[PDB]
Design a protein around this ligand. Structure first.
Ligand code: NA
Ligand code: NA
Ligand code: NA
Ligand code: NA
Ligand code: NA
Ligand code: NA
Ligand code: NA
Ligand code: NA
Lengths: 335, 335, 335, 335
């Protein structure tokens, strides 16, 4: 199988582990995190929004016993000193937050893994990849790859259809977003100075910033610069919705043409629904974006149109499943 | 003292009562609600989001004694049978849902009231009024008036300015709106058949249909048909935000230009701020709309622009402040 | 397979549908409810707390096709007109709320069904059953049965192990309960004039009355009238905890004694845990009651003790699992 | 004019400040907290559960201006280095959590503060005080004093009545408690390793241990060791409830006795209500504890009785109101 190591056992790594149990041909052989394995198991066994774990987890000496396999654990802050050489590590899923610079992620490579996928936006001379949107830009010469953001993966396939079948001029975004753990529980000083994230996370509508629309050009170059936008974090623990309002070059555009162009590009990454769903219905899904045709909208005043669309995504598992897809493809580029 | 009657003692109707305590000149003399007085008194005295009643409430024989004043109480399904002439009612606040038409609400007039303000949009040949946006259209000859909806009251001052100072071509709207009492507590059939208002209210991001933007032109006739949009209901009990994405006819606009223009329009209906606030900060405010300059964005690609602005409101108390303002002005046209 | 009909497709009925999908030898062939099929399918298809439906739901001509099997759907007010003779109905699961009486439920027999299980407490001369606590009192002569309440099934295994291994002198119960559909979304008047259920459910801690404790004697007759209690309704949508504070006649009781007595009585209905779990961790589980050992407490002052124990239960799906268990038993009494 | 210094401007700090504004005789001349003034001032003006600051708050050279008063701002880790001498600090409120021991708090006295009130339970040769419960014990000799905990203040006036009037044999306690800032926002490793405080605070019923009941002896020594208990922390952001279940010497006790007993011992710390209220109703109250006579229960099985009672409190402002009472009393013990 493809031998995967996870660096960081946060929400993302733990869900990537769960997800990989569902994907044949991938095995997590190693998990590196500073937390004690007792607590790590407990956060793996139990999950507030993603549910109980499917199977049995137990802490054994040197790691965990999970569904009858061995996962070796490490508590090692210098990733260059992890034994990726002798574990024959194919891909590292980098989920710590301390390694989003390519020059800094080359430690996994020096520790002898063959390829690293950063589970965040990343800086340096690397490629940023949204699976099924532009992974066909990977030629296998890459050793460090960005997995983009959770919001980019909800956006990109919607923007690519908009732009491809209608010209894209410009557009703006709002992701009504689930609150995350970098928001405070009660009103208190926030570690990065953010006055809005400083506020009780489950009691408020909280504006905040998002890099995803501004960065999209890294995934779809031909629309680089043409998008920007924000977020509003609201009290659901996971589950998100990206609204996009655009101006298109093609004139006289219908709701029905938009919806039809999205449906035509459905696949495993990009879903499509016409059902009247809410956020909790997408918790745990494995689509990267679930285009919602109940919300397509065309405002027309003379020759001039504003077009608005919305796509769902579990900012946890939607992004995890796209990571695992890209993770595997990186491996398969080794022949 | 202006003699005020409240028809229907729901959220709208009880907040009106509370707000009127803080306005001198106005006096609630009668309340009509089919609910027994004991329970009504209890929901007056206690309020989950709006607080304890600043004062003292008690059920006496013919109604309540509030702060040493007599409030008459009726339990009468038929408006035209209410003793409004007996009490010299100057204006009825109509909050039941059952008289949201010009000719229906006319029943209050036959019963004795001088004028009626409908706390809701209304069909018929009546004027719809957002105070400090278009109440100048009232010429004194109106017996029956609509106070518009709680979303319209937060949209109008913003659209007015954008249309006046720059040329509003078209726009689209999303209100990240608190959840309301017509949403289901748990997943269950919905009495109006709405598949989204059927889901659990405080557990979901729920898309919904909004009336306000489609009908903005009853308040501002010169932008009729240029706005549309909807709501995202989210798990806060009150406090909302209206995002507006628009195309203007002035094509070299800046964020400064937009914000300054909004501050120049500042008053006791249209607040202005540059504090990074969140939804629970506007709970119980009496601005009908609080513009947020920190959220203004202008997007320029080539020489085409998109502009996004946002404004806060208590979908309860904001709307309530505006309704009492229009109440007073309607009783003012005795002159 | 045993042919099951569900009267009333509310939370209990849709969950009973789902659980029966996981029991071999059990089949739901008909559902009665006054709501349209389109809304009912949507509610079976999408659940806020129990997850996307496992499988495929579609509305077909005379009802539903679910996982390749047709399910007849009726909207028939009158129970005794239901084609249960023609559908060879072994057990009707009665979940509407209006037939919580032995003699009222006879209508299902009069319609030709073989047995009725009432999914609530019921009055009249019949039996109240908590599976794996007192279902052996079922001899086979019963046509109508009650499956008690969700809170009863959680308390009954625990109180039995307490009364058997030590003598129960008295006790008091508090269940920290998920809020339910019978509570209001916003502060508003309430169907049964309850000043507390009238308050916003997801925003308060709400005291409310219970019955499961005063009525324990129906399932355990030797401790009749020796328990009482109430509930505190809090903002989790599903998942509860029952705390029981008891006086025993056995006198040098220890935490280890209690816990061990509880562990030994463990079965498919009565779970045992020592993990430090929280409410969401039991959402969807199938134990009728999950004993939490980490919560056991003994207060000793001289020769006088006080013991406290606590058990989790998914107030929805734990009670669903129990009902289905008793349904299967009722059908296995084909002599 | 009692000159007050506040060390740590957390929830306890900012609310103590707010409480002090409405108390004639006290003024906060200084605040020390390592967070920049700009952020601290923002978090004082805007509070999620407690409302906007009534008044004006601005940042000025050297600190804050609040309602036309100067408040000096420092940000010093070393308490000994703080200029309490020069500012003639009569009392310091110790609200950082890191000085919760008498030889730790002394660092303020050496700095020239006359007296110190620690806003938490603290260890050492000091006294632990619940105003209007055991503050009679202060003689004027103390320089450091603990204010106990926000549950001890809740529990102590109910215990005392029970003990004096009926004679407390033993009892156990459960407090249904709002979730606090030390709980995680999302599932993650916890600062103190607590596996239950490691979980999403707003999406769970969470058991957690509390010392309050165990250490009740520090306030009412004549029932030391007689109580034990725990907490259930639920998704309300402030407002809590302490449920006590006791055994008494005096028997044949009625509900009407217990309730009149608590009615008579009611003061400005200890309230008493017979209304059907809920947690939100007690947010921002300034009783230390509010007795709920609607939740009194007397289980009488034959000869032996179990008694239960309950009392609400706002774990924020109720405690804070109590502190500011004790603090004021410590200052006037400098005649
Ligand atoms: Na696998
Ligand atoms: Na580790
Ligand atoms: Na007034
Ligand atoms: Na009435
Ligand atoms: Na089955
Ligand atoms: Na039906
Ligand atoms: Na003062
Ligand atoms: Na500071």
């Amino acid at each position: 199988a493809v031998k995967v190591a996870i660096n960081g056992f946060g929400r993302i790594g733990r869900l990537a582990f769960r997800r990989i149990q569902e994907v044949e041909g991938l095995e997590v052989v190693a998990v590196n995190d500073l937390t004690d394995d007792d607590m790590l198991a407990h956060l793996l066994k139990y999950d507030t929004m993603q549910g109980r774990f499917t199977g049995e987890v137990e802490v054994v000496d040197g790691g965990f016993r999970v569904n009858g396999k061995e996962v070796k654990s490490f508590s090692e802050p210098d990733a260059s000193k992890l034994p990726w050489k002798d574990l024959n590590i194919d891909v590292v899923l980098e989920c710590t937050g301390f390694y989003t610079d390519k020059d800094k992620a080359q430690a996994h490579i020096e520790a002898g893994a063959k390829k690293v996928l950063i589970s965040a936006p990343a800086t340096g001379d690397l490629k940023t990849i949204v699976f099924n949107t532009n992974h066909q830009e990977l030629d296998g010469s890459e050793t460090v790859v960005s997995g983009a953001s959770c919001t980019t993966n909800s956006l990109a396939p919607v923007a690519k259809v908009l732009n491809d079948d209608f010209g894209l001029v410009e557009g703006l975004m709002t992701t009504i977003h689930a609150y995350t753990g970098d928001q405070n529980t009660q009103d208190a000083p926030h570690r990065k100075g953010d006055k809005r994230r400083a506020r009780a996370a489950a009691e408020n509508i909280i504006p905040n910033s998002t890099g995803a629309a501004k960065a999209i050009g890294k995934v779809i170059p031909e629309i680089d610069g043409k998008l920007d936008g924000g977020a509003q974090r609201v009290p659901v623990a996971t589950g998100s919705l990206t609204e996009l309002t655009v101006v298109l070059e093609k004139q006289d555009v219908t709701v029905e043409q938009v919806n039809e162009a999205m449906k035509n590009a459905s696949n495993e990454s990009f879903g499509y629904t016409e059902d009247e769903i809410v956020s909790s219905d997408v918790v745990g899904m494995t689509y990267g974006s679930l285009f919602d045709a109940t919300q397509t909208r065309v405002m027309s005043v003379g020759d001039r149109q504003l077009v608005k669309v919305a796509a769902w995504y579990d900012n946890e598992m939607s992004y995890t499943a796209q990571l695992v897809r890209t993770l595997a493809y990186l491996a398969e580029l080794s022949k």
